[PDB]
Ligand binder design. Structure first.
Ligand code: NAG
Ligand code: NAG
Ligand code: CA
Lengths: 164, 82, 59, 98, 82
């Protein structure tokens, strides 16, 4: 990145580490977690660090486990202003077939609703934990291989560990 | 933001005065606006924009009842939220 | 009835965060969802907005 | 009211099963493999289990086309993307690995 | 002291709806079938909501009311049908 480092150093990306030896960084190729990101009006980021935009108004499928069926996430888009080029996220629906085949729903506030029932946070069930983060944003955590973020005003995130 | 004098003719928009009342002609782009002394906006507009130009002066179609089609596209009965 | 407790004057209405506010920034609770005081909002067919506490929907 | 057409039969939400996946989860050819949400059914008239909706026509067999670039392709039809041919056998496109 | 025995919680049971089990906790909290709940709770018959924002109020039908069991001041209202 346009600056010099002595030999033997070990700078670390978020993903892994690299060490200087004979003017050539040696680097590991071990996987590191991805992050699909919804934000703004309609701006998506794939797990593979692709960026794009799709201003559709329906219930779209954001993510899903597709060899087995440990979960499935479903975004719900609506127009969000006077203009037609303004399509923000209103809610997201999560589905856990591992526990009751339940159906979590993150609402346009910081609210959550399991199977129609509004819920006070925290929600320690067996696997999934739902709690506030700054007391202004919800955070789902199923197991140790799944996280989420607030879908109040539309800034959904995910954290998928390399087991997926 | 820079106040200019009058008349003025830049970019194909002649900003003149006619009959003591101010005019803004855009014949290349197909419109003639003007204002009077009291203040009464007027917009003469060509037939090139038929069933098109949607806005606060409605679409240029033949009918007169459907010409509240909002920025989404919604026939609204209210002349106000439109 | 005519109950006894902690209120605030008639110009001010109660907000979720303990403070009470005028009806300008009093949010809407359409379908449970808590919308902010200015949220234009629409599917293809319906058209709804939140003005001052009430949710003005149309079709 | 309207007695719905012969090729399909009306449904009713049972009061016991929460899984009243009826009218709301109307399976068309797009959303068959996709998994759907549902609170309860409606007073609609849905195709049988062995067939799906297809542009205002309950196409019977699971032979309905295989879309690409928002265009129809009957089963067996091929497309040439790059130096590969690719055919839709059942419902998913079957390409070549050259 | 031994002569000090206050109420901690009360448990309500409605066989008319799911054979559920409501529980009013030592705060102003409520817990249906283990699940904590945000108030209000409009199910079909029973409504649970705050009163002064410091006290819960159950209302099943039109023949049953309750009051806060946080620090132990339970009440009931039974109409003459009982
Ligand atoms: C206006 O546009 C619509 C949609 O293209 C078209 O059906 C109609 O013929 C046009 N003119 C009139 C008479 O409305
Ligand atoms: C293509 O069709 C064959 C049919 O036997 C199937 O086995 C195979 O998995 C399909 N996929 C591809 C693209 O090879
Ligand atoms: Ca008109």
């Amino acid at each position: 990145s346009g600056k010099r480092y002595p030999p033997g150093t070990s700078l670390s990306r978020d993903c892994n580490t690299c060490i200087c030896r004979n003017s050539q960084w040696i680097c590991s190729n071990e996987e590191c977690p991805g992050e699909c990101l919804v934000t703004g009006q309609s701006h998506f980021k794939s797990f593979d660090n692709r960026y794009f935009t799709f201003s559709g108004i329906c219930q779209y499928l954001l993510a899903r486990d597709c060899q087995d069926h440990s979960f499935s996430i479903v975004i719900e888009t609506v127009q969000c202003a006077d203009d037609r080029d303004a399509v923000c996220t209103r809610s997201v629906t999560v589905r856990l077939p591992g526990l009751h085949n339940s159906l979590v729903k993150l609402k346009h506030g910081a609210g959550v609703a399991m199977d129609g029932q509004d819920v006070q946070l925290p929600l320690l069930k067996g696997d999934l934990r739902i709690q506030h983060t700054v007391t202004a944003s919800v955070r789902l955590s199923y197991g140790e291989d799944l996280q989420m973020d607030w879908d109040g005003r539309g800034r959904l995130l995910v954290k998928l560990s390399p087991v997926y | 933001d820079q106040r200019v004098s009058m008349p003025y003719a830049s970019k194909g928009l002649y900003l003149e005065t006619e009959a003591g009342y101010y005019k803004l002609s855009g014949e290349a782009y197909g419109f003639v606006a003007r204002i009077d002394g009291s203040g009464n906006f007027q917009v003469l507009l060509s037939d090139r924009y038929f069933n098109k130009t949607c806005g606060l002066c409605g679409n240029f179609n033949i009918f007169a009842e459907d010409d509240f089609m909002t920025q989404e596209g919604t026939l609204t009965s209210d002349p106000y939220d439109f | 009835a005519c109950l006894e407790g902690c209120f605030c004057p008639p110009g001010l209405y109660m907000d979720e965060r303990g403070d009470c506010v005028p009806k300008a920034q009093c949010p809407c609770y359409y379908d449970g969802e808590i919308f902010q005081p200015e949220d234009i909002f629409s599917d293809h067919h319906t058209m709804c907005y939140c003005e001052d506490g009430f949710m003005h929907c149309t079709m | 009211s309207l007695s719905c057409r012969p090729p399909m039969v009306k449904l009713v939400c049972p009061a016991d099963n929460l899984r009243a996946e009826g009218l709301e989860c109307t399976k068309t050819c797009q959303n068959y493999d996709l998994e759907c949400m549902s609170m309860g059914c409606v007073s609609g008239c849905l195709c049988p289990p062995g067939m799906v909706r297809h542009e205002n026509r309950c196409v019977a067999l699971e032979r309905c086309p295989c879309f690409h670039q928002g265009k129809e392709y009957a089963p067996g039809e091929t497309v040439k993307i790059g130096c590969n041919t690719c055919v839709c056998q059942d419902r998913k496109w079957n390409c070549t690995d050259h």
